């Protein structure tokens, strides 16, 4: 059908890729494959190498330094293409077979193998002031010709191509997310229950989140407001565990409940990026060069493996809060509140 080409400024080597994106399931990730066609007249001794780098930009879009370069690599895999690695056999797929059948015998293939527990391609929001490369983990495939592995990769005689790895939501939804906590004050031992539940476990990008809530205000107190917020917890794990708590969407419910009363109605939420542009630190799922994309789809993780070896993990948990008042003999409108969380998964379908 159609295969992508980058056609390096040297005009000699061109990288051919099957799919720009790459689906990564719960356990197995679709391998990448392609070929490169380089004019063999020039390549007398110089060897052509291709590579894939899982970059990690964190130092904004500031100017480059003498040796800082404000970058970090998570996984880098290089292979030799000219010659086509006679030492290691290449199990070329049908796409590779058709692709070098279309081209000549001088075209050379390449292949990598993504390991499972890696972050999906998510780029942090650059914001207004930043001008240049965006933050966040990013996949890049570049092809250059160099007889030495440590030799300089001259951009005038090299090429690069951008890859994103994406996850697709499971066909079978998980259990219904329900969580009801309770707590009382020192005035009396009559705690109140916050029955909070959702509709499903997997939601689609733009699908209306429908939070089901039910209050039981047995305590002799009032509820001024109910804080409903769907937040995005981005566990940025590179040298630390700086879990962010940016609220993607939130709403306020002014449904006061009398003491010794119960009340319940379903609220609707929709996470979207139209009004959250200016909020820096938001996680955006994938960027090719600068094209707009959605919020970060929640990353699927498999239990039993280490969760502390991953670059950026985005997980969504809608948080329900209710705020009360401590008025009485000695008190004012200011008081405390109790929070119970509700995890949910927000990702794309699997077409």
């Amino acid at each position: 059908t159609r295969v992508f080409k980058k056609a390096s400024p040297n005009g000699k080597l061109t990288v051919y890729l099957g799919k720009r994106d790459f689906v990564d399931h719960i356990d197995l990730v679709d391998p990448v494959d392609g070929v490169v066609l380089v004019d063999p007249e020039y390549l007398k001794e110089r060897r052509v190498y291709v590579t894939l780098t899982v970059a990690f930009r964190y130092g904004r879009e500031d100017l480059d330094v003498l040796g800082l370069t404000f970058r970090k690599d998570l996984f880098v895999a290089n292979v030799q293409s000219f010659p086509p690695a006679p030492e290691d056999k290449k199990p070329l797929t049908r796409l590779q077979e058709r692709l070098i059948k279309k081209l000549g015998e001088h075209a050379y293939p390449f292949t990598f193998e993504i390991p499972p527990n890696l972050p999906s391609s998510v780029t942090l929001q650059p914001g207004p002031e930043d001008t240049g490369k965006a933050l966040g983990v990013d996949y890049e495939v570049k092809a250059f010709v160099a007889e030495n592995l440590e030799e300089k990769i001259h951009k005038r005689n090299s090429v690069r191509l951008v890859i994103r790895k994406v996850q697709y939501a499971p066909e079978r939804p998980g259990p219904q997310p329900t969580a009801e906590t309770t707590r009382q004050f020192l005035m009396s031992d009559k705690p109140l229950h916050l029955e909070a539940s959702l509709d499903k476990e997997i939601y689609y990008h733009g699908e209306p989140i429908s939070v089901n809530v039910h209050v039981t205000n047995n305590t002799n107190k009032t509820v001024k407001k109910i804080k409903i917020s769907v937040r995005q917890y981005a566990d940025i794990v590179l040298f630390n565990t700086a879990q962010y708590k940016v609220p993607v969407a939130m709403e306020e419910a002014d449904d006061t409940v009398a003491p010794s009363s119960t009340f319940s109605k379903v609220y609707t939420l929709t996470p979207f990026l139209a009004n959250n542009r200016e909020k820096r630190g938001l996680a955006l799922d994938g960027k090719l060069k600068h094209e707009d994309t959605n919020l970060a789809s929640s990353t699927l993780l498999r239990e039993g493996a280490n969760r502390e070896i991953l670059g950026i993990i985005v997980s969504y948990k809608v948080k329900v809060k209710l705020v009360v008042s401590r008025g009485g003999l000695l008190g004012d409108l200011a008081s405390s509140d109790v929070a119970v969380e509700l995890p949910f998964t927000l990702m794309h379908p699997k077409p």
Partner: single-chain antibody
Amino acid sequence: VQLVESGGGLVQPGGSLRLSCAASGFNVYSSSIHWVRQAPGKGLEWVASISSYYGYTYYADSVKGRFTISADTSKNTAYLQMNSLRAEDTAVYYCARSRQFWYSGLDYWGQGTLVTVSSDIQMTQSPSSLSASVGDRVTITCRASQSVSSAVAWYQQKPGKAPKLLIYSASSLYSGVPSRFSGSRSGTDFTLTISSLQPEDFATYYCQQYKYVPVTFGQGTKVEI
């Protein structure tokens, strides 16, 4: 699962018109709303489109900034407010829906509001007309001035009814359409084939590109007997 479209009618030259278009059962933050014009016995013409997810407002070259917009997501309604209609505005306007994520052609179309008043990629279609009986092999080719990445969906419009797509991205046919329909990609020239010309299949076909904003329809090919 359908969409409604209203607000059109007779409007004097230089007037205004707030065309209302609403979708039932569609989240606005997962479906974009698009508007395509159509003159009397001519080709389609895209005028504007709005995607609520990014808050972006794309305009056509002819009515760039001269056509007001107003939409809300609580009522799942997008209103088309007109301003200073010219002589070229005497055209029936069709509100349409395409998947706001991973665009795959304007899938669900409205009934079309008929009003009357009193570089740019230019894809070309060939043949401009055809006449065939049942079972005759018919191939219709659309040629694009600048090459695209197979980002073309093919549509079947009968006389009067709302045009509907059959195959998106020129490769994959939509559900609900018989398998006898297909398409092909050949460089910058785009063709689709039909095996048997059934009485329902005897309808005008339209091609359009959506790789580069603004989108632009073909020339319009009429199928006769």
